[PDB]
């Protein structure tokens, strides 16, 4: 078990409701693995009031 672990580098909080997140490094095949799960949960699982 010799994994790799990122520190969160830079957040470009331009406005509040808009943002950019960088992250580096990972192991290979992990920029696909995490962010596909992360795009899913941030589309379809939150609270809400409408």
């Amino acid at each position: 078990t010799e994994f790799l672990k990122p520190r969160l580098v830079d957040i470009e909080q331009v406005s509040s409701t808009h943002a950019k997140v960088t992250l580096e490094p990972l192991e290979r095949g992990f920029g696909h693995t995490l962010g596909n799960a992360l795009r899913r949960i941030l589309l379809s699982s939150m609270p809400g009031c409408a």
Binding site: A37, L38, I41, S45
Partner: peptide
């Protein structure tokens, strides 16, 4: 990201 930790909690045990 905390809920993805919450859904794996059957497997830290």
């Amino acid at each position: 990201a905390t809920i993805l930790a919450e859904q794996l909690e059957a497997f830290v045990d």
